[PDB]
Amino acid sequence: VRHVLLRQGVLGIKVKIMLPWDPSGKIGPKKPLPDHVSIVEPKDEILPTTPISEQK
Amino acid sequence: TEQMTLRGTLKGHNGWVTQIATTPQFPDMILSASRDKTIIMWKLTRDETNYGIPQRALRGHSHFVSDVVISSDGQFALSGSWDGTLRLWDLTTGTTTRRFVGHTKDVLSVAFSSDNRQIVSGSRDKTIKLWNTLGVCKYTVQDESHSEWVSCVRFSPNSSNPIIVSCGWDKLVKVWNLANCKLKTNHIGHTGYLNTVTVSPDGSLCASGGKDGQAMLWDLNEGKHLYTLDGGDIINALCFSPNRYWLCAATGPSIKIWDLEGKIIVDELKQEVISTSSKAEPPQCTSLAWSADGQTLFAGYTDNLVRVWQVTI
């Protein structure tokens, strides 16, 4: 918040800025997203199995 | 032919019976664990007033007690619990001998050796671990290990064989050799993830299972896929028999008791009907264990009961 003067009256400034970091980087900010808290889900799920024994 | 009659039913829990194990020193007792955070040591009778009454309930864990196992002596007892820790009981009144601190997450499986100096554990830490009976870590296995949770571990007869079984949710069965801690072998052959594994008392077999749907058999002596049977949609417990060469398979609605010589189903245990809507008539069977006699077996169900059956000739 900043007051700035002029010859006739005063003007009020307000500045609000939203920080970008959330999971990766800094790490600093915590996980909860703005106003819809979201889950991030990796992918993989397959099989290739058939009978075999690998003797070591 | 031989068939099964419904013997009776025990009552004492407020939660699902998770595992049962049997003292061979006393067939008079029998031990149980459950999802209401107690292990019940029973006092059995063969009476009709009851088939048994709970003697005591050992307490201390802050979560469910998954698995329980007897000592060779039968005067100690060991536990694995969903609190991430283990306890080592002095099976008389209570009074923990030792509590074992390790593992980041739960202790699913646990077992107690013949030599009574080696104790293993499967954990969602993704670690098999070896344990002194002073409750300190003889070794910890975390390299060449499963990349998914370790489901169940087993001790195998140490006739001359230094082998311990491991099975995870990574669709593999790893065999580990004592005091070298290397992979003896890796066995592949389960579409679904593996729940359990167990070894014959004679020591030549490994009955393994999972959500494969098929129950595949492996060889304890070098690792060979002996044979397979179609049955056991979800496999939760397996148990060889001492008085016969059977194998008893725990499916959810039913138990399938199989003779393997030759491969055939002996019987299917079905519980009597109860009218439900839409459908909630089966309670899941999750555990089973034979008695020393091998006439009677007990079963753990999720209706909070331990159902008894008996073989009749």
Provide residues of B within 8 Å CB-CB of chain A.
171, 182-191, 216, 218, 222-225, 228
What's the 3-state SS for chain A?
CEEEECCCCEEEECCCCCCCCCCCCCCCCCCCCCCCCCCCCCCCCCCCCCCEEEEC
CA-based nearest residue in chain B for residue A53? B187
Residue B186 to residues B166, B178, B215, B274, B276: CA-CA distances in angstroms? 10, 16, 17, 44, 44
Q: Are B41 and B306 in contact (CB under 8 A)?
A: no
What contacts B187, CB < 8 A, 6 or more positions away? A52, A53, A54, B172, B173, B175, B208, B218, B223, B225
HSE-CB at B237 with a 13 A cutoff on CA atoms is: 27
Resolution in A: 3.5
Distance from CA of A15 to the nearest CA of B (A): 46
CA-based nearest residue in chain B for residue A46? B191
Task: Classify burial at B296, counting beta carbons within 10 Å of its beta carbon; exposed 0-12, middle 13-18, buried 19 or more.
Answer: buried
Residue A53, chain B, CB below 8 Å: the answer is yes
- How many pairs of residues across A and B have Cβ atoms under 8 Å apart? 38
Nearest Cα to Cα of residue B165 among B238, B106, B244: B238
- Provide the greatest CA pair distance for chain B: 56
Tell how far CA B162 is from the center of its chain: 21
Torsion from C-alpha of B94, B98, B101, B102, nearest 10 degrees: -100
Nearest Cα to Cα of residue B121 among B95, B75, B82: B82
Contact A51 B188 (CB under 8 A): yes
Q: Are B306 and B10 in contact (CB under 8 A)?
A: yes
Joined together, the tokens standing for residue A30 give 């915590």
Residue A13, chain B, CB below 8 Å: the answer is no
HSE-CB at B136 with a 13 A cutoff on CA atoms is: 1
Distance from CA of A25 to the nearest CA of B (A): 26
Whole-angstrom distance, CA of residue B246 vs CA of residue B239: 8
- What are the strands of the beta sheet with B214-219, ordered from one edge? B194-199, B205-210, B214-219, B225-230
Whole-angstrom distance, CA of residue B65 vs CA of residue B69: 11
Please list every residue in chain B whose beta carbon sits closer than 8 Å to the beta carbon of residue A50.
Answer: 188-189
Distance from CA of A42 to the nearest CA of B (A): 15
CB atoms < 10 A from the CB of B163, how many? 21
Q: Is the dihedral of CA B3, B8, B12, B14 positive or negative?
A: positive
CA-based nearest residue in chain B for residue A55? B185
Please list every residue in chain B whose beta carbon sits closer than 8 Å to the beta carbon of residue A49.
Answer: 171, 188-191
Contact B184 A52 (CB under 8 A): no
Q: Are B38 and B59 in contact (CB under 8 A)?
A: yes
Give phi and psi for B233, each to the nearest 5. -60, -45
Q: Which of A47, A50, A54 sits opposite B185 (nearest CB)?
A: A54
Whole-angstrom distance, CA of residue B281 vs CA of residue B274: 6
State which approach was used to obtain the coordinates.
Answer: cryo-EM
Tell how far CA B297 is from the center of its chain: 13
Q: Is the dihedral of CA B47, B50, B55, B58 positive or negative?
A: positive
Type of residue at B108: L
Nearest Cα to Cα of residue B156 among B176, B171, B138, B129: B176
Give phi and psi for B175, each to the nearest 5. -115, 140
Length in residues, chain B: 313
Q: Are B171 and B191 in contact (CB under 8 A)?
A: yes
Q: Which residues of B38-48 are buried (b: 16+ CB within 10 A; e: fewer)?
A: bbbbbebeeee
CA-based nearest residue in chain A for residue B228? A51
Nearest Cα to Cα of residue B253 among B286, B297, B222: B286
Q: Are B234 and B211 in contact (CB under 8 A)?
A: yes
Whole-angstrom distance, CA of residue A31 vs CA of residue B190: 37
Contact A55 B188 (CB under 8 A): no
Q: Best residue in B187, B226, B228 to probe A by mutation, most A CBs within 10 Å?
A: B187
Residue A46, chain B, CB below 8 Å: the answer is no
Q: Are B15 and B7 in contact (CB under 8 A)?
A: no
What contacts B276, CB < 8 A, 6 or more positions away? none
Q: Give the DSSP letter of residue B283.
A: P
Task: Classify burial at B244, counting beta carbons within 10 Å of its beta carbon; exposed 0-12, middle 13-18, buried 19 or more.
Answer: middle
Whole-angstrom distance, CA of residue B236 vs CA of residue B286: 5
Q: Are B257 and B309 in contact (CB under 8 A)?
A: no
Please list every residue in chain B whose beta carbon sits closer than 8 Å to the beta carbon of residue A46.
Answer: none
Contact B184 A50 (CB under 8 A): no
Contact A49 B186 (CB under 8 A): no
Whole-angstrom distance, CA of residue B9 vs CA of residue B18: 16
Task: Classify burial at A48, counting beta carbons within 10 Å of its beta carbon; exposed 0-12, middle 13-18, buried 19 or more.
Answer: exposed
Q: Which residues of B181-217 are buried (b: 16+ CB within 10 A; e: fewer)?
A: beebbbbbbbebbbbbbbbbeeeebbbbbbbbbbbbb
If you search the block for the tokens 């939660």, which residue do you land on?
B15
Specify which residues B187 forms β-bridges with.
A53, B173
Residue A42, chain B, CB below 8 Å: the answer is no
Joined together, the tokens standing for residue B31 give 């031990």
If you search the block for the tokens 């009074």, which residue do you land on?
B95
Domains of chain B listed by start with CATH number: 7-313 (2.130.10.10)
What contacts B73, CB < 8 A, 6 or more positions away? B25, B116
Q: Which of A49, A52, A56 sits opposite B191 (nearest CB)?
A: A49
Residue A55 to residues B36, B152, B183, B184, B295: CA-CA distances in angstroms? 42, 21, 9, 7, 38
Joined together, the tokens standing for residue B53 give 């009454």
